[PDB]
């Protein structure tokens, strides 16, 4: 028996962290019959509460149990003060905890909908109904929090006619400065938004799923003379982040190049079969690159370079150089699944030693954040410097098959 009379007078950190545990499923009820409804008076409900839930949720047009839920349900969940308080607290972070906020066009006012994990819509607002109370009741008078630019565009679920209709609404009324990022997932949908990307002045981050569009939209791969379909260089100086979700093998042709996109800073990668990082040309500065749940690892192919510039055999590199120490520090994190290996302080010391760090750090190419999650099928042994295994910019949480990780 919760009451919302209280629970806006909890401390704002606890009000963070309860919403941290509440991701997009704020409510939970989720799993010849020619669409008989069996609702008593609802024939004008499905005119104006299920014209668009049929389209967006066509799996549950049948719905053996939950047919009557989402009509009467979201009459008030866009006004419940708890969920509106979520959209108070997460603007006050500039969108860290649960952003997931995109643009949709439906019912002729361009509802700024939010979707859940299973891409089922929950809450919607329109523009002057949103920034009249959702914004000004967190930002009191000051003018930097009255700028919202963490709103995605995300064309993989809009059918294309909705897409090129929701492009032409921001040209005459200047909401283009609001738009945050854009998600992708030849395809007729994706090319519209890029030749319609002339001047938004507000792009940071990019997500593309799959091989076939990645090969033609991100890799330079030698070619610089595309007649139409500009990726024009004036807005090419804006981006910070690259996301790759699911692949088969990133460099099927020869090469995962980023000779352009010089301002990129973070690269998240995801559930991908093959990565060989020598195929990535690693632009001049990016301090973060990461991957999660990967299944084949070649890992820069430079351990044998250390083997050849210290001029010994691999067997002699193993049999006496590694001593399996655990002094005081490494009991702090668990990592009971991992066998860290360490180099020596006596047989090489002060010389033939910092040159090894030079070979490592010429390859690591000005980055520090690695963030490896779940692993399987590593091939070449994992090497980390001292400067990155100490002070924990390396982290492998669920480390199921990995052994002979080694720190220099």
């Amino acid at each position: 028996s919760f009451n919302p009379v209280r629970f806006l007078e909890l401390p704002i950190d606890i009000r963070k962290e309860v919403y941290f545990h509440l991701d997009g499923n704020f409510c939970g009820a989720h799993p010849g019959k020619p669409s008989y409804k069996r609702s008593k008076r609802s024939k004008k409900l499905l005119r104006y509460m299920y014209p668009v839930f049929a389209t967006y949720l066509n799996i549950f047009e049948y719905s053996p149990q939950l047919i009557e839920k989402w009509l009467e349900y979201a009459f008030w969940l866009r006004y419940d003060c708890l969920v509106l308080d979520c959209f108070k607290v997460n603007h006050l972070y500039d969108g860290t905890l649960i952003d997931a906020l995109e643009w949709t066009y439906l019912d002729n006012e361009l509802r700024l909908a939010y979707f859940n994990k299973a891409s089922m819509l929950e809450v919607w607002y329109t523009f002057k109904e949103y920034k009249k109370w959702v914004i000004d009741s967190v930002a009191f008078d000051e003018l930097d929090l009255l700028n919202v630019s963490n709103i995605q565009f995300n064309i993989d679920n809009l059918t294309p006619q909705l897409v090129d209709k929701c492009l032409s609404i921001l040209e005459q009324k200047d909401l283009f400065a609001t738009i945050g990022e854009v998600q992708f997932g030849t395809s007729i949908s994706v090319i519209r938004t890029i030749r319609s990307m002339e001047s938004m002045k507000s792009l940071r981050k990019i997500t593309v799923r799959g091989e076939k569009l990645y090969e033609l939209l991100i890799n330079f791969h030698g070619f610089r003379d595309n007649p139409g379909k500009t990726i024009s260089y004036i807005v090419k100086r804006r981006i910070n982040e690259i996301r790759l979700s699911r692949m088969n093998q990133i460099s099927r042709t020869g090469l995962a190049d980023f000779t352009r996109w010089d301002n990129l800073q973070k690269l998240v990668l995801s559930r991908v079969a093959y990565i060989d990082l020598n195929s990535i040309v690693f632009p001049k500065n990016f301090k973060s690159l990461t991957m999660k749940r990967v299944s084949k690892i070649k890992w820069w192919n430079i351990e044998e370079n250390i083997l050849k510039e210290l001029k010994v055999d691999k067997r002699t590199f193993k049999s006496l150089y590694i001593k399996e120490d655990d002094s005081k520090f490494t009991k702090f994190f668990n990592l009971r699944h991992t066998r860290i290996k360490e180099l020596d302080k006596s047989e090489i010391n002060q010389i033939t030693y910092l040159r090894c760090q030079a070979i490592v750090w010429l390859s690591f190419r000005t980055l520090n954040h690695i963030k490896l999650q779940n692993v399987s099928e590593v091939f070449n042994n994992i090497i980390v410097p001292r400067a990155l295994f100490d002070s924990k910019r390396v982290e492998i949480y669920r480390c199921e098959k990995i052994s002979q990780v080694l720190v220099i």
Binding site: F2, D13, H21, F75, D80, S137, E395
Partner: protein
């Protein structure tokens, strides 16, 4: 190897040197038996805290920075009803774990307090929707007056 601390009203709790390590903000106090004040937690609330910490000192607790084993985890079999005492004691418990910097009980109380929201009915949403005057009264009149007809 027996360390003690004092409560909000003042009582003595011998624990052990190694059961006490789960309060990391007690481990900033063991740079040096030794007493430690926690003035915002009562006796029985930290009795619940110490019983939790004693029985899951027998287990392993994950990496506390991954957003994988936090945003989706089992609650426990044990911690269902021992953190289902009452509405109001859970608030005192989560303030207490915010003090003692034991993140896993803070998230474990967050599990149950998460459960008491995923599963509230749509008929308190009928009535407990405008507890706080966010919209000015003309438009909560209005919100019923573009919704005059479904009930």
């Amino acid at each position: 190897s027996n360390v003690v601390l004092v409560s909000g009203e003042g009582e003595r709790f011998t624990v052990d040197k190694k059961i006490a390590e789960r309060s990391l903000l007690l481990k900033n106090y063991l740079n040096d038996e030794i007493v430690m004040p926690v003035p915002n937690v009562r006796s029985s609330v930290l009795q619940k805290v110490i019983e939790w910490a004693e029985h899951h000192r027998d287990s392993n607790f994950p990496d506390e920075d991954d957003d994988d084993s936090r945003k989706s985890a089992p609650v426990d079999s044990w911690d269902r009803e021992f953190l289902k005492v009452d509405q109001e004691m859970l608030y005192e418990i989560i303030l207490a774990a915010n003090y003692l910097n034991i993140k896993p009980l803070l998230d474990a109380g967050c599990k149950v307090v998460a459960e008491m929201i995923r599963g509230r009915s749509p008929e308190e949403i009928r009535r407990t929707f405008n507890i706080v005057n966010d919209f000015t009264p003309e438009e909560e009149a209005a919100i019923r007056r573009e919704n005059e007809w479904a009930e």
